[PDB]
Amino acid sequence: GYKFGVLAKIVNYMKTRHQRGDTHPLTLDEILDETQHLDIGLKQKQWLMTEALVNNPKIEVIDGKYAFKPKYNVRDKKALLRLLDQHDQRGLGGILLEDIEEALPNSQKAVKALGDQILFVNRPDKKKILFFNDKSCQFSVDEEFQKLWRSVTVDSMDEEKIEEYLKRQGI
């Protein structure tokens, strides 16, 4: 095909820039010169600028020149914790640890610094999902109690038999 893999290459170049650490936004024509996109037609570049650059969430537009959003990815562990709290409040859910890793250097040290406040759940793809803990309410469950729970099955109990058990026990 034509004019798709080139866009993919530009986006990959942006990730490479971010592994470089150049926060300063760059001109699209200069990016093309670096990526050997001069051969491509100008009209495809204009269509990219008008539509695809804005659609891409990672990309951002500043002073008429396009670059990634330094706010989107996590930069400090405190902001990661605050984002987790906000996500818990608004029901967003956890965020993928691979994305957080490529976002933030030493993200594993950030999680170690979190400690108990941060809850991580394993996934079959090994991706880690992070959920903020609830400060307001703290409870402890013991394994023997959970087992004593586990055995009993209300599904065995028939609903009429339920209301009957309350009425029998005189309350």
Partner 1 sequence: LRRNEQNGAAAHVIAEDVKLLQFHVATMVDNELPGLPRAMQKSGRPLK
Partner 2 sequence: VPAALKRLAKYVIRGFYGIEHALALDILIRNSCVKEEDMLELLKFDRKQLRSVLNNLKGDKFIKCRMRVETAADGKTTRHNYYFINYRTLVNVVKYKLDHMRRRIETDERDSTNRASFKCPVCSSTFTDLEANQLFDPMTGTFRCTFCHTEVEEDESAMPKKDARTLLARFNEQIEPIYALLRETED
Partner 3 sequence: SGLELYAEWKKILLSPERVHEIFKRISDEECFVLGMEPR
- Footprint on this chain of partner 2 (rule: CB under 8 A): 91, 93-94, 129, 137, 139, 141-142, 144-145, 148-149, 151-155, 157, 159, 162-163, 165-166, 169
Exposed (0-12), middle (13-18) or buried (19+): which is 31, by Cβ within 10 Å? middle
Among 136, 138, 151, 156, binds partner 1 (CB under 8 A): 151
Compute the distance between CA of residue 143 and CA of residue 149 in angstroms, rounded to an integer: 10
Compute the distance between CA of residue 73 and CA of residue 103 in angstroms, rounded to an integer: 5
Query: Pick from 14, 5, 7: which is nearest to 68 by CA?
Result: 14
Q: Between 28-35 and 5-20, two packed helices, what is the crossing angle to 10 degrees?
A: 100
Query: Least distance to partner 1 from the beta carbon of 124, Å?
Result: 15
Residues paired with residue 68 on neighbouring β-strands, in sequence order: 59
Question: With CB cut-offs between 5 and 8 Å by kind, which of partner 2, partner 3, partner 1, none does residue 39 bind?
Answer: none
- Check residue 27 and report its DSSP letter: -
Query: Least distance to partner 3 from the beta carbon of 170, Å?
Result: 20
Q: At 55, phi and psi to the nearest 5?
A: -65, -40
Among 65, 69, 75, 161, binds partner 3 (CB under 8 A): 161
Query: Least distance to partner 3 from the beta carbon of 148, Å?
Result: 20
124 binds partner 1 (CB under 8 A): no
Binding segment for partner 3 (CB under 8 A), chosen from 63-71, 123-131, 138-146, 151-159, is 151-159
Which residues bind to partner 1, rule: CB under 8 A? 147, 150-151
